[PDB]
């Protein structure tokens, strides 16, 4: 057969000069790769800055705890009630090691659960981590890194000066219990001679710490509890300060937004998986061509329009929103649909229109979300993200929930109503001064929005100095903010497809993995994949005789009970369609290889189905 298929070897090197940026220069010098790398570096650095600014308080408290032990038997120890999302916290512990090394207050070992199956391996990795960490601040074999060598090394180095010997244990739940209790007794035996600090990483709760530490072990523990912030609070902070920021030209659609938050809130609390899914959304958006490299800030966008070729003109014509733009316009549409240079000259107005519409969308949302989410029962939700998904997914005024918001705001007393609208005005004005003024194309956005806010404030003064005026104030709020600057995504200004990402099907396919659905629809109707002219089934339980051989065996399998004799199965398959016995054996072997059946051991010539 193939040379890779060998009876002896299992791994096959194809070395090409390996000693001791995958793409070619055509792709990296393409503008869409440049804009994708720029937007991704900006988004990733902003999210990392948000994560560091959220961790910084607990970091200062842990560093103060270690330095307070250094100013000074039980080993001092600090439980850190971190979240379920364990991989994310390695950056937290790395920042703790960076601070402790920068202050020269301590040296840090990190004890992973994979390195400590036994007490011997735990002591060896602990001493090796402390000695090599001190060597890396300013190589003995792992067989000889005894705790006596750690004491001799600490006396040769830091006895003349006291550095703490911090021992991070990031995955406290994953440890063997006996190894961890013996290690705590070993570190408690050396207190006084060696200053140990034992910070921990408890993903669950303190009841796990009180359960895994027995009376003897907890007799030598002086632990202090720190609390990392909750994962949904971090998701809400990232979604409000990054994915809804005015300064980024790339926006998700409401379906993609709801899908990524559904993966976070309904499956895994890892921020990192949400970031990689947003990165795949950004890549799937920006790899469609240089027409999507127009999706950037306005000056580089004008340079990209003056760069453009012809395939980019074709893919800005093909996108669905251009067709209403053409039919809502004769010589002008001949010059648009053929002359190309006229479309190059008319692109900046459409790009400024789209970027200005999304800036006005963010400002009108920063208005509306306080005024709606302060209400009891919250028909449109509390935070900005739910109103973002609601105003993008469908027209907002036609929804029943907007009618409920108008009714429950109509039922208010005058004082709380005027205080609520004035709070919305002050919040919107603070947002217009803080976040839209530095931004390019923010002066025109402030020039559009600010007189409308002055008109709403004059309506507030009219209802202050004078019952039915509250309905006029609601009408002014509706038709200068909700109606004009908060349109549904289908009613967005044309060639908004360059800026939003609405293709949810392929990205849901490539992020959410469902092997069982593909195996099910391949073993039930092969015609969905093969697209034969003869193999179509009008219903999935028909069992036609022209099917591929795995499907017939799978259906005769599916249509009966648990334990299955092979012989009547073979008679039924022979009745459906020598080499036929070898084809049945090949199908049973493939169906066992997929895990659908298994051979019985206690009973020969029988098979049990593993599925239900």
């Amino acid at each position: 057969m193939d040379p890779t298929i060998s009876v002896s070897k299992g791994c096959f090197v194809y070395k090409n000069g390996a000693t001791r940026s995958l793409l070619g220069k055509e792709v990296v010098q393409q503008p869409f790769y440049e804009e994708y790398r720029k937007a991704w570096n900006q988004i990733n650095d902003h999210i990392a800055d948000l994560q560091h600014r959220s961790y910084a308080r607990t970091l200062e408290q842990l560093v103060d705890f270690v330095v307070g032990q250094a100013e000074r038997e039980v080993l001092p120890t600090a439980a850190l009630l971190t979240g379920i999302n364990q991989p994310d916290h390695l950056s937290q512990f790395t920042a703790l090691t960076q601070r402790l090394h920068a202050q020269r207050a301590a040296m840090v070992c990190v004890l992973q659960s994979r390195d400590c199956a036994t007490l011997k391996a735990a002591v060896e990795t602990l001493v090796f981590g402390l000695v090599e960490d001190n060597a890396e601040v300013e190589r003995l074999r792992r067989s000889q890194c005894t705790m006596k060598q750690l004491k001799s090394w600490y006396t040769n180095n830091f006895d003349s000066e006291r550095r703490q010997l911090v021992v991070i244990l990031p995955d406290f739940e994953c440890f063997n219990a006996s190894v961890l209790q013996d290690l705590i007794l070993i570190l408690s035996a050396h207190c006084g001679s060696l200053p140990f600090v034992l910070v921990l990483g408890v993903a669950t709760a303190m009841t796990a710490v009180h359960g895994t530490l027995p009376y003897h072990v907890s007799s030598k523990i002086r632990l202090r509890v720190f609390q990392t912030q909750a994962a949904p609070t971090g998701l809400n902070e990232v979604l409000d300060k990054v994915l809804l920021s005015p300064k980024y030209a790339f926006h998700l659609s409401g379906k993609t937004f709801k899908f990524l938050t559904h993966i976070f809130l309904y499956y895994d609390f890892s921020i990192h998986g949400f970031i990689q899914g947003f990165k795949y959304c950004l890549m799937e958006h920006f790899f469609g061509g240089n027409a999507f490299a127009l999706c950037t800030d306005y000056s580089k966008a004008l340079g990209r329009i003056k760069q453009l070729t012809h395939e980019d003109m074709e893919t800005i014509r093909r996108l669905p929103s251009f067709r209403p733009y053409v039919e809502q316009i004769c010589k002008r549409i001949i010059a648009v649909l053929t002359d190309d240079d006229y479309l190059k000259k008319k692109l900046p107005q459409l790009l400024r229109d789209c970027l200005l519409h999304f800036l006005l969308f963010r400002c009108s949302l920063e208005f509306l979300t306080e005024l709606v989410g302060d209400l009891p029962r919250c028909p449109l939700g509390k935070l900005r993200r739910e109103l973002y998904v609601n105003c993008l997914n469908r027209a907002i005024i036609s929804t029943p929930e907007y009618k409920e918001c108008l009714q429950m705001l109509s039922f208010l007393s005058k004082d709380e109503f005027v205080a609520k609208v004035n709070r919305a005005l002050e919040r919107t004005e603070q947002f217009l001064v803080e976040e839209i003024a530095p931004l390019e194309l923010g002066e025109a956005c402030t020039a559009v929005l600010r007189p409308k806010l002055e008109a709403i404030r004059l309506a507030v003064d009219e209802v202050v100095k004078a019952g039915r005026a509250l309905q006029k104030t609601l009408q002014l709020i509706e038709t200068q903010i909700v109606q004009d600057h908060l349109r549904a995504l289908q009613d967005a200004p044309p060639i908004h497809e360059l800026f939003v990402f609405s293709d949810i099907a392929t990205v849901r396919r490539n992020i959410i993995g469902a092997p069982r659905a593909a195996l099910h629809t391949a073993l039930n109707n092969p015609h969905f994949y093969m697209q034969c002219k003869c193999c179509e089934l009008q219903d999935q339980s028909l069992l036609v005789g022209t099917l591929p051989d795995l499907s017939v065996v799978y259906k005769l399998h599916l249509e009966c009970g648990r334990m299955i004799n092979l012989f009547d199965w073979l008679q039924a398959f022979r009745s459906v369609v020598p080499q036929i016995q070898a084809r049945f054996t090949r199908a049973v072997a493939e169906l066992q290889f997929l895990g659908y059946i298994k051979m019985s051991k206690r009973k020969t010539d029988h098979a049990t189905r593993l599925t239900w």
């Binding site: 067709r323 001949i334 649909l337």
Partner: peptide, 17 residues
């Protein structure tokens, strides 16, 4: 509606106008 036949029919509606 396919983009090619739509663009052709719109150009025909322009040239017939």
């Amino acid at each position: 509606e396919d983009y090619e036949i739509w663009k052709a029919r719109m150009l025909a509606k322009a040239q017939a106008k």
